[PDB]
Design a protein around this ligand. Structure first.
Ligand SMILES: Cc1nc(N(C)C(=O)Cc2ccc(-c3ccccn3)cc2)sc1S(N)(=O)=O
Lengths: 150, 53, 94, 50
């Protein structure tokens, strides 16, 4: 997206470039969330490495049954937030359960929100850094493309 | 009632002026009768047609 | 193969018997109201219409045991809805 | 009124897909998901009275 948006050096008033940039950034977000759907069942792909220092989800009482798998955990805890039943989002320590895993559908309405958060940080930096400032690029995930997962 | 109050009894020198009651009532509230006239304009007021492609 | 329908069965005297099925004998359930192509074609020849023709066509019409007596499909918000199913409750003066 | 296949229409009421909320849709190129429409308690009478 940044390679395409700094390729817009075509002679234009700065105001025009801000909009034809924000449109492309929103389109890139769209193409990312569309491809996210085709990997909604790969829990290992939607996994975050929590450090032993960071705040961590509480360990389910059945992850203490991995046998010769609890030993692999030395530094990182790989957690995926799944959504059993409804409303509640619970964390699953991915590497403490035998494979292949069976899980409730992955709460992509939580991981994609954080990924998008950092994407909007980068996009707000570039939007307010090359052209005129004053624009916090926000993608309406909760309305435009929330239905795909929740 | 302030629009019908007179300041002189002579009908050709009366100070009464046209009343705004019905025109104002029609302009604001009775202008939305078209919404309920087989148009679906009430939906158009709050439609939010979110169809993702 | 998922996703799957989930039904609710009211039994006698009571008891909500929930039933999740992967396939079912719907041919048997609808067999009573299934009109053969010959019958419908013959009625169409007798009545070449759409209002008077539907008239003739309509006029020509244990939890496991209660499955084929009472079913109530249960809405699943996770899945996408493909049919507009409206429940018309008509009240009558006479 | 202009049904070109009456027998099909009659033998379409017996297919469970025609009367199931989340039935399989009966080569899809594009698909438009209407996932949100109007809100609740938004009547013009209610919003004017309030
Ligand atoms: C807020 C606003 N100001 C408008 N007034 C002045 C009124 O209703 C005044 C009124 C109208 C009827 C009654 C009554 C009394 C007994 C039984 C039923 N009814 C009481 C008072 S209307 C309302 S509105 N726009 O929410 O309908």
């Amino acid at each position: 997206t940044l390679r395409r948006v700094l390729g817009l050096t075509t002679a234009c008033v700065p105001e025009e470039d801000a909009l034809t940039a924000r449109g492309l950034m929103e389109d890139a977000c769209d193409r990312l969330i569309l491809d996210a759907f085709n990997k909604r069942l790969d829990a290992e792909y939607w996994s975050v490495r929590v450090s032993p220092f960071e705040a961590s989800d509480p360990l389910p009482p059945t992850a203490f049954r991995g046998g010769a798998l609890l030993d692999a955990e030395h530094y990182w805890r790989r957690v995926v937030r799944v959504c059993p039943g409804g409303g509640e989002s619970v964390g699953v320590p991915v590497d403490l359960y035998p494979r292949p895993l069976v899980l409730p559908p992955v709460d992509c309405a939580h991981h994609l929100r954080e990924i998008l958060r950092e994407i909007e940080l980068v996009f707000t930096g570039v939007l307010a850094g090359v052209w005129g400032e004053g624009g916090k690029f926000v993608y309406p995930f909760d309305d435009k493309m929330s239905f795909l997962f929740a | 009632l302030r629009a019908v109050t007179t300041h002189d009894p002579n009908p050709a020198a009366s100070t009464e002026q046209p009343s705004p009651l019905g025109r104002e009532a029609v302009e604001q509230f009775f202008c939305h009768v078209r919404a309920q006239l087989n148009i679906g304009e009430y939906v158009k007021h709050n439609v939010t047609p979110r169809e993702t492609v | 193969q998922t996703p799957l329908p989930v039904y609710r069965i009211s039994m006698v005297p009571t008891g909500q018997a929930f039933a999740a099925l992967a396939w079912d004998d719907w041919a048997r359930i609808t067999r009573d109201a299934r009109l053969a192509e010959a019958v419908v074609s013959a009625e169409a020849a007798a009545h070449p219409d759409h209002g008077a023709l539907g008239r003739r066509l309509t006029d020509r019409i244990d939890a496991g045991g209660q499955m084929y007596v009472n079913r109530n499909e249960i809405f699943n918000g996770a899945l996408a809805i493909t049919n507009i199913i409206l429940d018309l409750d008509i009240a009558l003066k006479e | 009124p202009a049904c070109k296949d009456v027998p099909a229409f009659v033998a379409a009421h017996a297919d469970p897909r025609r009367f199931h909320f989340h039935a399989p849709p009966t080569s899809p190129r594009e698909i438009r998901v209407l996932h949100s429409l109007g809100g609740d308690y938004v009547s013009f009478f209610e919003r004017k009275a309030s």
